[PDB]
């Protein structure tokens, strides 16, 4: 019935790095082609970019976008995506059994990111390619001019260097499904040397070393330890990847999975700190959660699409249609990410844009349309800028089918100190059972209370609305905030 929480401005965890509200676009399915890039379309600008899509990305407010992978980077040759479009070859994408026409590549994606006010986080091919190729791409992108690959960019129509600040040293390569699969020692060495060479070309860049594909890989977290043991002095981030699903059809247990995310994050931090002690380094490795989302709906349909039907262009792959309960977990995941903002400095919702996405365009050749998961992200990105406060908390507990002592309330307050605002993000994962949250602001004028709810957890959005959308409702005295929170909803409580 009742949950108490205490909000204290003297109680920081960390300043939020806006890059934790990043996303990710892979050359996968309809993410690029028949997605963000649709040449002949009425809704497109002169570059072929869908203008309505651009507005929806700006609406989400995404500071950084991971590109171009993902699976697909592990056998990608970046040269195929630059220069005169007529001379760009069509390539086999082994990752997703598709034909990559290479009409969009780096230069094209760079000006798309400009239009959505985002910076590129570039992944390099360390599956089938190595050090010198990563050096070539970095020179192409970051060096002003007067050398082979920098002049090549100038010739291709981009005078100013892209100045890509964050680079991914390959994609997760511990999986037996990925081309250019490496052992932890093999990748550790190639990551170390690639990183060493890259920072000689541009010392200002930041580098991400790949973690495990998932925490369920037997080589987790030893991988993380081994890779960092090699590359510590030359990398800045280790990456984490996590997806959740509700195939079991257990909403209670499904919403408890943010606790597993918390444990996952802590395990990686512990691994980082262990290697830190081994190195006697004063530097902390930070966490780049460059792949996170709900993903399970389109599993069977994807298995159909291949084989079926191989080597198509832009097949409708990974097209999850998100339910309301999915939006709740995404909200819970964002809360968890925010709790660890001291170590997590970059995070990417996978993905942006048709592929397991908050933004969907129909199919040959629009509309566009927000999924349920769009809004918890939008709220987090918009009101989650500032300083994370320690969530001292006492919430009723509940057991689920596969979890014990799961908190009914999951909450964080962030204090924006240059705007004099405090924003409380709260989720209740029960779902059964409305509860009143007594927030003792010890600082510390109610402003609004935004809510995200439905009576039907399985309800979805489509091209015709929009059954999940932020209702601006509800529902102060002295230094105390009391908040009735509906049984399962995403809550954004704002004080001035
Ligand atoms: O974001 C899109 C792509 O996914 C990332 O890697 C993971 C891929 O997803 C997994 O497939 C899920 C299956 O369900 C589980 O039972 C089992 O682990 C899997 O067979 C695979 O592990 C990967 O293909 C990529 O980084 C990105 O391209």
If we measure between CA atoms, which residue out of 440, 411, 441 comes closest to residue 428? 411
Q: Could you give the CA distance from residue 147 to residue 263 in angstroms, rounded to a whole number? A: 47
C-alpha of residue 75 to centroid of ligand 1, in Å: 16
If we measure between CA atoms, which residue out of 396, 464, 389, 391 comes closest to residue 430? 396
3-state secondary structure the chain: CEEEEEECCCCEEEECCHHHHEEECCCCCCCCECCCECCCCCCECCCCEEHHHHHHHHHHCCCEEEECCCCCHHHCCHHHHCCCHHHCCCEEECCCCEEECCCCCCHHHHHHHHHCCCEEEEECCCCCCCHHHHHHHHHHHHCCCCCHHHHHHHHCCCCCCCCCCEEEECCCCCCCCCCCCCCHHHHHHHHHHHHHHHHHHCCCCEEEECCCCCCCCCCCCHHHHHHHHHHCCCCCEEEEEEEECCCCCCHHHHHCCHHHHHHHHHHHHHHHHHHHHHHCCCCCCEEEEEEEEECCCCHHHHHHCCCCCCCECCCCCCCCCCEHHHHHHHHHHHHHHHHCCCCEEEEEEECCCCCCCCECCCCCCCCCCECCCHHHHHHHHHHCCCEEECCEEECCEECCCCCCCEECCEEEEEEECCCCEEEEEEECCCCCCCEEEEEEECCCCEEEEEEECCCCCCCECCECECCCCCEECCCCCCCEEEEEECCCCEEEEEEC
Through-space distance between the first and last CA atoms of the chain, rounded to whole angstroms: 27
Q: Could you give the CA distance from residue 456 to residue 327 in angstroms, rounded to a whole number? A: 12
Q: Which of 177, 306, 347 to mutate to test the pocket of ligand 1 (most atoms within 8 A of CB)?
A: 177
C-alpha of residue 340 to centroid of ligand 1, in Å: 24
Asked whether the beta carbons of 21 and 347 are under 8 A apart, the reply is: yes
Q: Could you give the CA distance from residue 237 to residue 232 in angstroms, rounded to a whole number? A: 9
Q: Could you give the CA distance from residue 290 to residue 279 in angstroms, rounded to a whole number? A: 25
How wide is the angle at C-alpha 314 spanned by C-alphas 25 and 105, nearest 5°? Answer: 50
Binding site membership of 213 for ligand 1 (Cβ less than 6 Å)? yes
Q: Could you give the CA distance from residue 337 to residue 73 in angstroms, rounded to a whole number? A: 26
Q: Which residues pair with 475 in a beta bridge?
A: none
C-alpha of residue 293 to centroid of ligand 1, in Å: 12
Resolution (A): 2.7
Binding site membership of 320 for ligand 1 (Cβ less than 6 Å)? no
Q: Tell me the technique behind this structure.
A: X-ray
Residue with tokens 């993410």: 31
Supply the residue whose CA is at minimum distance from atom 10 of ligand 1: 213
Structure token pair of residue 146 = 């007067």
Backbone torsion region of residue 157, taken as left when φ is above 0, otherwise alpha when ψ lies between -120 and 50, otherwise beta: left
Distances in Å between the alpha carbon of 327 and those of 301, 361, 378, 431, 470?
Answer: 22, 19, 11, 14, 12
Pairing of strands 22-24, 64-67: parallel
If we measure between CA atoms, which residue out of 64, 70, 102 comes closest to residue 86? 102
C-alpha of residue 291 to centroid of ligand 1, in Å: 10
Q: Which residues pair with 275 in a beta bridge?
A: none
Binding site membership of 74 for ligand 1 (Cβ less than 6 Å)? no
Asked whether the beta carbons of 494 and 449 are under 8 A apart, the reply is: yes
Asked whether the beta carbons of 50 and 38 are under 8 A apart, the reply is: yes
Pairing of strands 12-15, 387-389: antiparallel
Pairing of strands 410-416, 64-67: unpaired
Q: Could you give the CA distance from residue 217 to residue 181 in angstroms, rounded to a whole number? A: 14
C-alpha of residue 353 to centroid of ligand 1, in Å: 17
Buried/exposed code over 209-237 (b: 16+ C-beta within 10 A; e: otherwise): bbbbbbbebeebbebbbbbbbbbbebbbb
Binding site membership of 302 for ligand 1 (Cβ less than 6 Å)? no
C-alpha of residue 177 to centroid of ligand 1, in Å: 9
Asked whether the beta carbons of 139 and 201 are under 8 A apart, the reply is: yes
Burial class of residue 248 (count of CB atoms within 10 Å of its CB; 0-12, 13-18, 19+): exposed
Sketch out the chain's domains with CATH numbers.
Answer: 1-16+385-496 (2.60.40.1180), 17-384 (3.20.20.80)
Structure token pair of residue 435 = 């509860």
């Amino acid at each position: 019935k009742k949950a108490r929480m205490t909000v204290d401005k003297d109680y920081k965890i960390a300043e939020i790095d806006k890059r934790i509200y990043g996303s990710f676009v892979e050359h996968l399915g309809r993410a690029v082609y028949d997605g963000l890039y649709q040449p002949g379309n009425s809704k497109s600008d002169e570059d072929g970019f869908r203008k309505d899509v651009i507005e929806l990305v700006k609406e989400l407010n995404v500071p950084i976008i991971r590109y171009p992978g993902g699976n697909f980077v592990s056998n990608y040759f970046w040269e195929d995506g630059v220069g005169p479009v007529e001379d760009r070859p069509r390539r086999l994408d082994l990752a997703w059994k598709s034909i990559e026409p290479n009409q969009v590549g780096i230069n094209e994606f760079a000006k798309w990111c400009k239009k959505v006010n985002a910076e590129i986080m570039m992944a390099v091919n360390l599956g089938t390619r190595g050090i010198s190729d990563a050096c070539n791409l970095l020179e192409y992108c970051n060096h002003p001019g007067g050398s082979k690959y920098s002049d090549m960019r100038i010739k291709h129509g981009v005078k100013e260097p892209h100045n890509i600040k964050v680079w991914c040293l390959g994609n997760a390569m511990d999986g037996p499904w990925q081309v250019g699969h490496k052992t932890m020692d093999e990748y550790g060495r190639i990551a170390e040397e690639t990183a060493r060479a890259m920072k000689m070309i541009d010392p200002s860049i930041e580098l991400v070393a790949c973690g495990s594909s998932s925490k369920d890989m037997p080589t987790f977290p030893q991988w993380e330890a081994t890779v960092l043991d090699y590359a510590y002095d030359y990398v800045d981030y280790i990456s984490l990847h996590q997806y959740y699903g509700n195939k079991e059809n257990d909403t209670a247990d499904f919403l408890a999975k943010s606790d597993d995310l918390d444990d996952f994050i802590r395990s990686v931090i512990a691994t980082c700190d262990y290697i830190k002690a081994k190195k006697r380094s004063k530097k902390d490795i930070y966490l780049s959660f460059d792949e996170w989302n709900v993903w399970y709906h389109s599993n069977n349909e994807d298995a159909n699409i291949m084989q079926n039907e191989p080597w198509r262009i832009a097949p409708p792959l990974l097209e999850d249609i998100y339910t309301f309960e999915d939006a709740l977990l995404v909200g819970l995941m964002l809360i968890t990410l925010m709790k660890h903002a001291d170590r997590i400095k970059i995070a990417c919702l996978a993905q942006l844009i048709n592929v397991i996405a908050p933004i969907v365009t129909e199919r040959n050749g629009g509309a566009a349309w927000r999924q349920t998961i769009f809004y918890p992200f939008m709220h987090a990105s918009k009101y989650g800028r500032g300083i994370v406060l320690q969530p001292v908390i006492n919430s009723p507990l509940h057991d689920t089918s596969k979890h014990e002592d799961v908190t009914d309330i999951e909450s964080v307050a962030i204090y924006n100190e240059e705007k004099e605002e405090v924003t409380i993000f709260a989720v209740n994962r029960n779902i059964h059972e409305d509860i009143v949250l007594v927030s003792d602001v010890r600082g510390m004028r109610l402003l609004e209370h935004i809510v995200l709810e439905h009576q039907d957890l399985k309800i979805r959005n489509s091209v015709n609305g929009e059954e999940v959308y932020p209702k601006n409702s509800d529902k102060f005295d002295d230094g105390i905030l009391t908040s009735m929170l509906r049984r399962a909803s995403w809550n954004v409580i704002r004080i001035g």
